Write a protein that binds this ligand. Sequence first.
Ligand SMILES: *[C@H]1O[C@H](CO)[C@@H](O[C@H]2O[C@H](CO)[C@@H](O)[C@H](O)[C@H]2NC(C)=O)[C@H](O)[C@H]1NC(C)=O
Ligand SMILES: *[C@H]1O[C@H](CO)[C@@H](O[C@H]2O[C@H](CO)[C@@H](O)[C@H](O)[C@H]2NC(C)=O)[C@H](O)[C@H]1NC(C)=O
Ligand SMILES: [Mg+2]
Ligand SMILES: [Mg+2]
Lengths: 481, 481
Amino acid sequence: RPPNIVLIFADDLGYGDLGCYGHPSSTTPNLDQLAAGGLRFTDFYVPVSLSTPSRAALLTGRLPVRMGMYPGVLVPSSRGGLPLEEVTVAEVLAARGYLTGMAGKWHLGVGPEGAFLPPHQGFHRFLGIPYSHDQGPCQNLTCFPPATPCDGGCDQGLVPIPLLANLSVEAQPPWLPGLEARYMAFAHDLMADAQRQDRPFFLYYASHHTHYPQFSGQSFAERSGRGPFGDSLMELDAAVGTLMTAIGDLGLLEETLVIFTADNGPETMRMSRGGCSGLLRCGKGTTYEGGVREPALAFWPGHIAPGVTHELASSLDLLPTLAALAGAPLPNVTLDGFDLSPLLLGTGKSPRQSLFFYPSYPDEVRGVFAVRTGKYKAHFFTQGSAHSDTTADPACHASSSLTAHEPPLLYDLSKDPGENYNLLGATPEVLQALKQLQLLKAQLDAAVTFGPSQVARGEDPALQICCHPGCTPRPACCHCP
Amino acid sequence: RPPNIVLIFADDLGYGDLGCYGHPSSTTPNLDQLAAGGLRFTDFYVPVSLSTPSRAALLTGRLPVRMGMYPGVLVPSSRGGLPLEEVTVAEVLAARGYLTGMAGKWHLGVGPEGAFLPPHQGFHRFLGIPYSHDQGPCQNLTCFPPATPCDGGCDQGLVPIPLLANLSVEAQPPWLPGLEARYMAFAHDLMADAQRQDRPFFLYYASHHTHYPQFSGQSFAERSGRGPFGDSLMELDAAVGTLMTAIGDLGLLEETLVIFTADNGPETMRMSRGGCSGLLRCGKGTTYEGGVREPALAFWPGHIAPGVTHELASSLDLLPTLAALAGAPLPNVTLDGFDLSPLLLGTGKSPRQSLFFYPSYPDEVRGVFAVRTGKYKAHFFTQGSAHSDTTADPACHASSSLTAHEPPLLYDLSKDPGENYNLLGATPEVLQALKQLQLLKAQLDAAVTFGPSQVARGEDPALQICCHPGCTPRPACCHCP
Ligand SMILES: *[C@H]1O[C@H](CO)[C@@H](O[C@H]2O[C@H](CO)[C@@H](O)[C@H](O)[C@H]2NC(C)=O)[C@H](O)[C@H]1NC(C)=O
Ligand SMILES: *[C@H]1O[C@H](CO)[C@@H](O[C@H]2O[C@H](CO)[C@@H](O)[C@H](O)[C@H]2NC(C)=O)[C@H](O)[C@H]1NC(C)=O
Ligand SMILES: [Mg+2]
Ligand SMILES: [Mg+2]
């Protein structure tokens, strides 16, 4: 009865990057076709605009400060990880009998002997890389076949990036032009195996696209007409069409819920090799709309009718929605999202009225940076980020430092989604939205206690995954392509 | 045989304003539905980003400097107008027997006794206003019923805005909340009369939306969820759905070509009461992509198949395309556009490879400001505009003055449609695009001779239209609502 679930989570992809969100040159025909037969969200969000914290919020339905996923993101030598006590979506569904699987980027911790890898947090199967694909040296990797090198090098002084199969190293580094096919094959098998055992599957496809450095297999190389970023986006888009073909082929169309979104806004610092936030301001790394507002599609033929909703939703709402849809019961913890099944099925409205945004480097004295209620968004603190540099708007740059705003900066996102015209720069509607925004910030800051930081537990180079355990010299002896 | 033609031309409407071009809150379901069953252009342009010149280019297929339509726009007291010798699209079709009609804004000159009004340039019928609706005082007009006044006042010291029926004043001023219905009724009659006489009609619907000040009839007032700009946009969108219903009702669906575009980018100076260029830079008044790149839809069921083209097209190409489609012969003059029927019908490619952009205040020493060839656009001169002020990008402001660029600023619009990353800030592809752009600018500047300016022939207040001819005191005695 419970539907099969496929959750596709792109990386560093902006609001204005899909064809259906208005980009003029992107090539994304399969995602356009899922939008044309599904529910396209104009106002969907992540609460924090960096990789680790966004991934924590999606899998647990909880604000990332609650379990210590701040500040910044995890690195290969990190001791910390998403605590084992947190209950992930995969745990929830596994318990109700789903065959659960994951392909792609994890970025929730590796840890002493791989204690924080996906196999320990509810996934029966896992093929992927434990953190971003640029967190290891890439000056010798090929990003586009036959022999176009990845640009710029990536992180230095580290072990090459490992492709893992559950807890084992399958390759190190892997061959980037072929990851996609490896991942389509793993997905195909998980589906067919679940069909064979009469059980609902759960696939978590965390693509590496469209994070730096860009890479694609040879059928996309130089075919998109938007350069490397396009080629990579187009391969993501062809992976989606492949999952949808597999779904067809097994007669699972009307029995599978498919959701597509992305962790955080675009890295405009990669300039024309990075994404596009469309009309929204800034990108990755900030609490402006361009870093937290993501594309989001939901497609379940015969259940979700084609259309466009403007209602509020968050990545935080998808554990509780998915639990509801599968008759699985919610963990016994404070959850920050809601069930959106009425909205999806067309019998209700979203229960969500407010959204709370924390910065990359949060703290307990300052609290949440921005809050949206209804159509109004208030910024109490503002800040630019090096991930959002190089555009003409100077509020996005790393040189725009932390600035308190009292009274906050106040925007009407229905008329001014671009965040240009501060409404307090008076009216009764406004003054009443101002008092509610202030009360919601003070209530949340008074009730949330931050979990102790996982990222500040430091680093240990000995925690790095090595294909040839005990070899020497570390890290470059660690490799087995 | 020749199809019926309906040409809808919006006012001050940006690339990112329709739902189908990605806006998050606009309400435009009828335009979304024409896009979903028609050809949506991602790269369509006007050559000059102001009202008069754009309107001249569309009706004549010629660069506006050729017949003196510069600098700036015409005003009510202007002596000048689009010369009578120019052959307009309406002239072309009338000669092949179309019943030709026009509703809405003309802005191509009034002149001594109305010599330049539409009835003299090929339209059998005309109901509309001879220039923009803000070019007369509006502090006492109602923009939204029952009694919401137009905001800010409009131009002072002038006659109220006249609604004309051919050459006669029907009302002065007209009641803005009802213009739309007046215009739907005129369109309905022109269609049915043409059906009755067995003849092809040509309708030219130059809406006042979404120019300042905004206004709508009462079914849209406060219903769009994007405020006044939205209400006005939504009424434009409901007028389109009305024309399409009328087309249905007479069984003319498969026999009518319908084209939708707009004169120029958004007036961001009206802030949240003005339009949105999406990911493009700046707006009205500039030669950046946000002022010259417009939305554009073409819909002719059973002839134009649904889709998206990225090929180059201009408003300049639509006299010659429309002549071709109706078997009417081209005037005997140098034309700057091309026939796009192959592209529309799906048998060819656009013949257009290059686009030439002039500024609002052109001159013969400087020549064209920017040129696009293929994917590359070069800016030889750059300039901001008061119509594009108030955003965060300082290149759009009136304080960014005229700056020569040598070598030009060079952008790859397929990877960088936002015009952020100057590619000469080297490569053989680039250096060859640079030499071609430079040669195309020098060829065009050497071959075009500017026609003597119509706008500099001055003003005469006695040329103002008056409902009560000879009355006193002028201009406020001129009125007959
Ligand atoms: C590693 O871990 C999982 C779990 O054991 C492997 O398990 C699957 O492998 C085969 C089918 O692919 C079967 O032998 C097992 O039944 C199956 N187990 C479950 C619970 O499905 C898996 O192959 C490895 N992970 C992947 C796919 O890389
Ligand atoms: C003014 O000018 C035109 C042309 O005379 C008027 O003409 C039309 O009016 C009636 C139908 O609407 C008929 O009496 C005429 O046949 C018809 N003429 C043509 C050539 O179509 C018209 O009513 C006025 N313009 C409008 C519609 O306002
Ligand atoms: Mg990311
Ligand atoms: Mg205009």
